[PDB]
Amino acid sequence: FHLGKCPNPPVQENFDVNKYPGRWYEIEKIPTGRCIQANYSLMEGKIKVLNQELRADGTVNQIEGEATPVNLTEPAKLEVKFSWFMPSAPYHILATDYENYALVYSCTSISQSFHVDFAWILARNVALPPETVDSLKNILTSNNIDVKKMTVTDQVNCPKL
């Protein structure tokens, strides 16, 4: 919960949705499970999403949704919807190299005077070099997004996939 309008960081340049699908593991996030992963598949800039996690008891929580480009100008600005009852939430891909990492950002106003935001660092592998994670946090920080509440997702106590 923060003062002001939503930050509007620049998004990934020349974003190619065709190179984005498949499995991504959640490395760190602003807390909104362990072994957290997302699976994306192409529809037609549209993406089908299956998010899955393991709980402490070893049961699996899954949710399915769809991500739709918000507009025709910026293919890295999507909105995702999981349930009929839930309004779409931004899914902005701030940066990705499609083979190693992705930084995703989402912000929602609470009137024009306040906002809440979230971010996820994702990877193709279950870990990233500390230098990559730092560089990505630097993108958030330099766009006035607080990274200090970010937590490290448990990808250690997990099945080999």
3-state secondary structure labels for all residues of 48-95? EEEEEEECCCCCEEEEEEEEEECCCCCCCEEEEECCCCCCCEEEEEEE
Instruction: Write the burial class of residue 112 (CB in 10 Å: 0-12 exposed, 13-18 middle, 19+ buried).
Output: exposed
Name the structure determination technique: X-ray
Backbone angles phi, psi at 4, to 5 degrees: 100, 180
Q: Are 49 and 26 in contact (CB under 8 A)?
A: no
Q: Are 129 and 114 in contact (CB under 8 A)?
A: no
Q: Are 20 and 40 in contact (CB under 8 A)?
A: yes
Rounded Cα–Cα distance for residues 81 and 90 (Å): 9
Kindly state the tokens that stand for 127. 């870990």
Rounded Cα–Cα distance for residues 50 and 26 (Å): 13
Rounded Cα–Cα distance for residues 156 and 94 (Å): 26
Instruction: Write the burial class of residue 66 (CB in 10 Å: 0-12 exposed, 13-18 middle, 19+ buried).
Output: middle
The CATH number of domain 1-161 is 2.40.128.20: yes
Backbone angles phi, psi at 75, to 5 degrees: -65, -15
Residues 6 or more apart from 53 whose CB is under 8 A from it? Answer: 33, 34, 35, 36, 37, 60, 61, 62
